[PDB]
Point group: C3
């Protein structure tokens, strides 16, 4: 597994954005052969989204034939509610680019059969063959999306009960827990692993235990992210604060192995 | 991988038995499409067998279209002998339920070609497609069936030489010299090929195995840890087996699986 | 995974040779159906090559229908240069046996398309189906061939930049002149290695003690590539006593007893 050690989150976002553009332009997407991109939400990928937008503004990439899949959506919340995952993506990304409505895919949190909605999504992915690049972040406990630790590595898109901790964390909702959704639809670990490439963004001191588990730890189902060690092409892009629990030699190792790719970041 | 932390072995057996009944009833087996169930022997699964027999007597499940496969059998011991694995399965389980002779499968320890016998067993499993649910226990050193620690994850059904410790253990039931030297056993790959694996684990002497299984990483010295790579594996355990786990670990799964725990 | 604990490298070599002989003669190779053998270079496999030669001279095995692939080759260096992997293989093994020229496969380090040459090499391997037995060594840090630690387990045959440590090491064979030492090598990938039907890794010396520990007692871990062999269907490590220094007493005791029958006479 690749590690990209950078100093600040801003550089992480730039490197991640540069990496996404590199892959799009090498792929040469067309209407028949779209580039298929998996996408996350939250504070971490936000620097990436703004780097991408400016790169697009500068004429360095088009999303006209890029198809996207997001990892998550709240169950029960209006799609156009400002706190929906859909809203996060449109207001922080899609609205700023030349992406096409038909090429955007998000889980529908408000159908009358969650199982069927989750299956529809998996089928849609499979209809393109394979996700070309999947971006994500990682929980403090190494989890991915709303998949619990000890999630099966072959787990698929399904409904998840939000943890008590997550719910009180997300109390955007007028400081009210009763308004926070109890369930989310989320992609599975197997759904993730099926991507041709996985790129995980890791920033902040709070993720230091998770990075250690992912980089120096061994394959362990309690730290879901460590499973990427078995994936054919996986990248982690990280900042200096997230490296605190690593050995000095570990950082030295990857900083030098990736030296050529770190230049200009 | 799932962990079901329960108080005592009695509840483990009942939980496992309920889960087997759920799967059978969800599957709706028929003559054409039987339910295929992998089975272990020994003290631990005994509770499960007895609860199953009760549920069946209560009208809660039928084994008429259930096909079974066992993990092991001794080499050289008469099938009808009281200490055979065949005898264990009939005297403690099969004789009590509506299962059909033609759907019971066990290894034959007394052919003139063990390699072919083992091959025959694998072939028959594959004539049903897959094993739908495989129940097992686990060694103190995390091994499965008669597979050695450090067994290949792709190991198949084969003859195995019994360790002198296992043979010493069984001396009560025979004098060391009349205790069998070899067993036929399914491989780790045989096991992993199942749709679902349920491993029952009870007692203070399995705490290191459980630790390795749940908190440890994937390691060929603890065969059971490979379950972490299985699509659907679940471990059902008792309090004495959790002594080497962290408090937070037990707490995690106890609360995660709470809705599946109630009643047990 | 199998661990064969032996006293000294001499016996490790004789064991590995006899295992290679055992697999060839059970396979019974012909023109139509050759035995495909993957091979390493260096001081450690040397003892195996010597014992293989003595076994062949006494009439115990024939390489007439044995097909070979090697792990590595320097980029930019004449293939007949004494320090090429080709030269190692020929001078220490191939010149001494009844192997056929057309059945020998090595990477060409001197084409104008390294990617195309690595692709050609993978294609040739697949044209035989599988490598029946792949013999290798391990780095002090657990790496395989010229694959970096943290190499994808799916990595394929490709060009690799030598670390300065390795280039410092090989400067002796280029007469103390690092500026003579090759900058690149072509190497089979970890996915390439793992595709073999069987993998046998030789581990000798006190300096491989940590790699062997990571490999045998450690868990599956991309920083120690050799630990992925825990996931391979049929892997064996043959090792000497110096290499076991970081293992537990009981770990050596277990495999020594487990493999006692296959150890006798070694
Ligand atoms: Cl080395
Ligand atoms: Mg637009
Ligand atoms: Mg009956
Ligand atoms: Mg010759």
């Amino acid at each position: 597994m690749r590690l990209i050690p950078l100093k600040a989150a801003a550089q992480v976002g730039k490197w991640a954005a540069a990496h996404i553009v590199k892959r799009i332009n090498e792929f040469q997407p067309t209407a028949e052969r779209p580039f298929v991109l998996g996408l996350p939400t939250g504070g971490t990928p936000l620097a990436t989204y703004k780097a991408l937008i400016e790169m697009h503004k500068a004429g360095e990439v088009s999303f006209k034939h890029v198809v996207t899949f997001n990892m998550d959506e709240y169950v029960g919340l209006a799609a156009d509610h400002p706190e929906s995952y859909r809203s996060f993506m449109y207001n922080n990304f899609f609205n700023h680019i030349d992406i096409q409505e038909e090429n955007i895919n998000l889980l529908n949190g408000n159908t009358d059969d969650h199982e069927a909605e989750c299956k529809r999504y998996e089928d849609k992915i499979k209809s393109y063959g394979k996700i070309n690049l999947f971006m994500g972040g990682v929980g403090n406990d190494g989890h991915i999306a709303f998949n619990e630790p000890a999630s099966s590595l072959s787990s698929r898109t399904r409904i998840k009960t939000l943890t008590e901790d997550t719910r009180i964390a997300n109390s955007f909702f007028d400081g009210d827990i009763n308004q926070v959704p109890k369930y989310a639809l989320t992609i599975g670990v197997g759904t993730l692993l099926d991507a041709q490439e996985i790129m995980i963004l890791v920033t902040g001191h709070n993720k230091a235990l998770a990075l250690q588990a992912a980089v120096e730890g061994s394959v362990n189902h309690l730290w879901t992210v460590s499973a990427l060690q078995l994936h054919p092409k996986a990248v982690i892009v990280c900042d200096e604060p997230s490296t605190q629990e690593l050995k000095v030699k570990t950082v030295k190792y990857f900083t030098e192995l990736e030296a050529k790719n770190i230049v200009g970041f």
